[PDB]
Symmetry: D2
Subunit: 498 residues, 4 copies
């Protein structure tokens, strides 16, 4: 306490005098321009909001730990996955389409964004609750997300727009099937699996390469809500998932996931009968079984949601030695996009905020800019230099690379032996779902098509029949009778929609 303290300060540390009354000319007079405490507090209030994420605006998370319990050193040299290693983590969960204040229990994909604070940098595995996605080229991603959001005139979400996009981009079928099935509505984030989705590259100490898939299997099981239940919860508690996570950890109920990988030898990646670089494809566990790595535990709530969760900036570009990207076009687009969005959303120095700083020493050739908190003193700004300030200069083929040859083109990826748009979705509907799940699926899909413009409905019937003739007929019959579930978060029809 200072001699003239009053209970709080202005931004310069001087006593604020009052947090409750403005500076006026007498009790009845106007406010004066030089009420600097009023000005500082209001000008800051007016700049509290930052642009929400696009997509995945609505979310929350927690800190935890990852422990390696198996030996996978033969597949990677990454320090984080070496035998016995324990690493601090941060995980943010999210929906995709909805904005900052939208209900948690809308039918949607969920994000599973995981950071490992490793000894050789921050390693971000930015996943979802599905092993696949709707698209295989990033040029389509902007269109997709806009189709999932709002009409330009009325500002409403619209199933007609969603189905127009999906039916005109049949590569979407595998993921749309997954979304419309039971897993479109997780009961809690604790009761859903996480996946890397993409094929990544692992490189071992000898330079040998494997293509890898990541699977985070919940120790709490996979539990889902019905459309009706999720709708009810959306009204009663729009932050049901956020609350559940925080309360579970606060009570000492720490959720866990076991990490497994699939590991494909380098050369087999080029010849496998499904394209591992096609994000719409899963890789059969019969061909490439899951191999255990270790266990993820979440055990610590944030102390400040905005500083630690909202301001967190995850990026697939945040690889570490031993782990690389792959020829998956969607992943390569992501390598650019996140960092770019974060410069706008948070700032040029987003990676100097405590939650985004690595544990190891950063020695990076970047200087100046707004809000530069940790400056580099008189370090040289150029390389090579004669001043003893180090730089990197490895030449030749990179350890996390691969080969390419061809002419510059814009075209679809070449099909492997068993690649198509509909086969894997079919397999899901026919072989994986139970009878009860198929019944629910029909009611969901028919519901999602209710009120959809007729020409778009007609294309949807052909789309679903391509997935499976029987399910597609069942959906068609129900839509023609105007039956089906209400879908939390979206509807179609009426004068304010297409």
């Amino acid at each position: 306490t200072t001699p003239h303290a009053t209970g709080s300060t202005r931004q310069n540390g001087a006593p604020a005098v009052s947090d409750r009354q403005s500076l006026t000319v007498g009790s009845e007079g106007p406010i004066v321009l030089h009420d600097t405490h009023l000005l500082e507090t209001h000008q800051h209030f007016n700049r509290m909001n930052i642009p929400e994420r696009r997509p995945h605006a609505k979310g929350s998370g927690a800190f935890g730990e990852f422990e390696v319990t198996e030996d996978v050193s033969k597949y990677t040299k990454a320090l984080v996955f070496q035998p016995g290693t324990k690493t601090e983590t941060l995980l943010r969960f999210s929906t995709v389409a909805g904005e900052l204040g939208s209900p948690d229990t809308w039918r949607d994909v969920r994000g599973f964004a995981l950071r490992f604070y490793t000894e050789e940098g921050n390693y971000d595995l930015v996943g979802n609750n599905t092993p696949i996605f709707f698209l295989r080229d990033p040029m389509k991603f902007t269109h997709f997300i806009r189709s999932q959001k709002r009409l330009p005139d009325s500002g409403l979400r619209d199933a007609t727009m969603q189905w127009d996009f999906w039916t005109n981009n049949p590569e979407s079928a595998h993921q749309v099937t997954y979304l419309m099935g039971p897993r479109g509505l997780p009961r809690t984030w604790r009761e859903m699996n996480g996946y890397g989705s993409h094929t990544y590259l692992w490189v071992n100490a000898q330079g040998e390469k494997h293509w890898v898939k990541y699977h985070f299997i919940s120790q709490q099981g996979v539990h889902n809500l019905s459309n009706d239940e999720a709708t009810k919860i959306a009204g009663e508690n729009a932050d049901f998932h956020r609350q559940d996570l925080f309360e579970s950890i606060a009570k000492g109920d720490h959720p866990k996931w076991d990490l497994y990988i699939q590991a494909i030898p380098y050369e087999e990646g080029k010849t496998y009968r499904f394209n591992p670089f096609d994000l719409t494809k899963t890789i059969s566990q019969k061909d490439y079984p899951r191999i255990k790595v270790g266990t993820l535990t979440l055990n610590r709530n944030p102390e400040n949601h905005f500083a630690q969760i909202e301001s967190a900036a995850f990026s697939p570009s945040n690889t570490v030695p031993g782990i690389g990207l792959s020829p998956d076009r969607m992943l390569l687009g992501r390598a650019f996009a996140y960092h770019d969005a974060q410069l706008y959303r948070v700032g040029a120095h987003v990676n100097q905020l405590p939650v985004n700083r690595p544990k190891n020493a950063v020695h990076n050739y970047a200087f100046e800019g707004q809000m530069w908190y940790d400056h580099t003193g008189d370090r040289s700004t150029y390389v090579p230099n004669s001043n003893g300030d180090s730089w990197s200069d490895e030449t030749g083929p990179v350890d996390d690379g691969w080969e390419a040859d061809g002419t510059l083109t814009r075209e679809a990826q070449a099909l492997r032996a068993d690649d198509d748009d509909f086969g894997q979705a079919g397999t899901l509907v026919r072989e994986v779902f139970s009878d009860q799940e198929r019944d629910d699926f029909v009611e969901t899909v028919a519901g999602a098509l209710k009120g959809v413009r007729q020409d778009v409905q007609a294309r949807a019937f052909e789309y679903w029949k391509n997935v499976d003739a029987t399910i597609g007929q069942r959906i068609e019959d129900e839509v023609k009778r105007h039956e089906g579930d209400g879908i939390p978060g979206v509807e179609a029809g009426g004068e304010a929609r297409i």
Copy 2:
């Protein structure tokens, strides 16, 4: 169509070639850095979101017309209110606390933001659906809004925080009573009244001054939802109000409001038994009756929600000759705050966007800055100048002013004869509400207090007993039995809250 057209362009107008596939080295190869269409489209996608309004993030609106049907020329010289004048309008409706994607049917205040595109500038009457507010000094406003939003650790709304603030700021009682009563949940925006809330100054052609209140009385009546109904709708259709407005106008059902004023002679403003400059007070219609002015009709939907509604920037500083502010401290704070927030939210040149431009010629001493669309050529940048570029230089007392005298102070406004924190709220509960409304009010308030930390509940009981001894006891009895309604948008208790 150009000779080499492909169906769409890049930002420079050159053909885009593809909106569907990225530029790769062969079909199987990586994406190249020089896919400039991928880069432009993604970099723009990443900068689509802007900071949401704080407060009043969730909203929508429509264009319309205001017609003057009475003669109020004796009270004001403002062109917009002269006999027979018809003026184009824009109205945005909103909630207060919730973010961009939050349900429309939460219990809350609603915004009623009205712009008139007058011949002498844009006149903004930025109102609410209540004639009063919770506070009488703008220093408290930042605290209030933060109390209505989320806890810093868990990110949840919390009734304990809301009641802690309200019970420690008893000036809030009049508005908290209004909010907890029937009008806290409008059925539609068409079925709610709008109010200026503040006293404004009107000045006539001779310089005579009146203090005025604005009242917009819905021709559709005032209709409200129950807590249970609003909760159900929040789940089923989070954009119920936005949809209702758009569909009603699209069908030709144009909602109307009649404008009335109360007009207090200048000197009587200083002596009236309730303080007209205290935003927590209504002015009795027995003392100062409502006088009709004209009728507001909404008749045209936006063609682009984001450009015309989200990017609209309303401000109480946007007065026109004949209409001024008043010694209401809250209004004086608002004169600064909106324009300031909009510089951050939209940009320095927010008032050059079409929706925010006036109809008349702007000749303003402001130049340069980012995104300066309409430049001033070689116009002089300073005054006086010898180049024939005009400026303003009226000296002496302004026509929309008043007197003040005193020492610089931070203290509460002096009480008029009948000013207090609780009397008007009481009158509402005892005399205005029906028996059924009182019964509902008890269930609402008791519900809002369920799970609230006990020390804060105890202060709430004293607060409600100060409003009315009988209602306060009824609330206390119900809270002690753990009864009451669920309140859409908020709750208390549990490990993630206070």
Copy 3:
């Protein structure tokens, strides 16, 4: 060093691999999109620049110490000025009109911006190298600065614009005389005086008030350059002053200034024969003599110019207990303007950057926003609260206030007995300047008028004759003969100017 280190890292702390070659498909192939090190480094490079200050863009500074050597406790309770106190300082010097890369030796005002890192907050005394300024109302300031900068079409500085403004605002005469005299061209920043210019309020422990002027008298003396010398230096070394300061401190030659105040009793401020609240007036040292306080020494160079000097954010609003503002309209405008500019220039959290943080604990009701480095955990966001998080709530007249009474008006300040626009300037020319200084002054002013549009020249002759009939005739005679010095930084005439 990590096991896989390469000499530098990316922003996530992972090895960068190369700071010298991009990632390509073979040696001859294109750059791939996923060269994330290329992207991070370029995207940061592209965001290194921040808006330059307006005005005072060109500058540099150093750290030092202020030691109180006299007892002025009877005039102020401010901790920084209590007997024997030593306080760390930061001082930035600057010109006014020129941009970031403009020569240091243009004829101009110099800034003298001094921060004291006190035990009760950062106290900023943001002065100039003159005791007066050109204007007495902040509405004119924007116009003035724009007149000192560039024409809207050609982008050139123009003496015609400068004189058009000055001659149409005769309040400018006192400062224009000072600027055109010897002190318009300091040889070094070490060899110029600094001044607070404005009257400030000092309040002692008993609540007694004095109006104060600050004077920083250089121990190195006041030494100036001729127009010809300054022009030569502008070509040979555009950073002459910046270099001089850095080299002098590096060699151990620490420049010093002694601080003196003038102290006017509170009531005498209202009756003195020159208006102490008029920034165009000096206060006679015969009436109110200088009183010594202590000594300022600069002794430490920055380690990083951009982080410590460019990103420094000084503000007259940064008062501390014992020191307040005054009824000087220009000072009251400054209380708002600096903080506002800094939110745009640097960011919302400009006062969390190390150079701008106070030494004492900040407990301020501001939360969230972009680049929030030092978060407040779970501290309450509202007041009063029941959670033990303190706030301020002092009521009544503030200790650094004063009285006012009147109607809202826009008009000139009332004249004291001896106030006018020209008298003090005259006194300077007639009584203070030597014969040689008068001769130089004539050559400077005539030079500054060379090529000026004839109608503006004619008004300038009347202006100078009002200052002093003899000097004004001498200037007129020289201008009519087209004689006079070239003025570093500006000229008039020709097809690209007025």
Copy 4:
């Protein structure tokens, strides 16, 4: 004029009342918070400055016209270069290293940024006044520019840093030779040549490809200043080039350049004895002669420098059909970097500002964002769509592409038969320069090395001897005697430098 007009307005179009006095409580009282005209004007003034370009901050330009006078339709299908076509242009000239207010006559590269407003989009040819550059990989560019700017502690330019960079990157020799020769100091922008520097791709109507170099040969000749003359001018008139251009056009003296290309058949690009994709190499005019295209005339000054020149945003990504990029790594980096910098410098909608809009219709899949002036109404936001809103979907090899094959690598480009770092520079010194130019060159280079740290000087002597043994010895001898010219804009040595 409106009935209540006062000579100017606020931003909402209402009369401003005064541009000269603030709103106070009586003449002697404080300024009130609700002086909204003071607030608007100051808040805008505070946001007038935008980040300067990095690099090429200091510049100016003019509009003009390009006329095709020859038939080059066999080489390109680009509309802009078809027989007889006349196209409106905008050209911005600039230096590179210096900031916004830095003198025009520093020794430096000059920018030559040319936009053609074509019928098929804006085509930007963003050149320099040299056919080569210092570097051949964009990873080095950030380092280079930072080396040309200021030391991190003192904020001074430093020749030691410049030479440390250049001598450690010997690829720089060709361009450093050009810069240190006569053409480092153009007398005017009218008296310098412009060059595209890079190889670009031209594609004709049949799909046949040629690699092209652009050369803009001044009809005013090439005229240069001495170091001493340029230094003198830097002091006397820091805006000498800006003024010269504006005055010449104003007087009707319209500067012209003739455009010539070199055209290399596609296959010969891969085998030519100098690498056409190496920006440090010129292509011999004996092997590939210059072919005339047409003439560029500048004939119209800007009406607003800031809106039309400062806010102009040029980009090499702004190609048009018939013109593509090439495998030059530096060009490929530029395709990303400009647009990125402009999003920060100006805004997301930089290409909606009038100067940056194309003449033809833009139909681009980008929506929303700050300051969106020209919205897209209810146009579909996704593709394909069933709503009649067109998109692009060309599949297969692009017309402006080429082939690549290899593994992902970071390494130097493979050498052609006659590629090295020093040979072309030599040829310049030995064969192109006259005796007098060689004498001047020695004095320039020796001057540039004066005061440079001895170890860096020693490396510079080896560097210059590699260019030419005789010139290198002459430079060494002069440096060891401490002789040489002063170089405008830079020096070395002393306590504030390396």
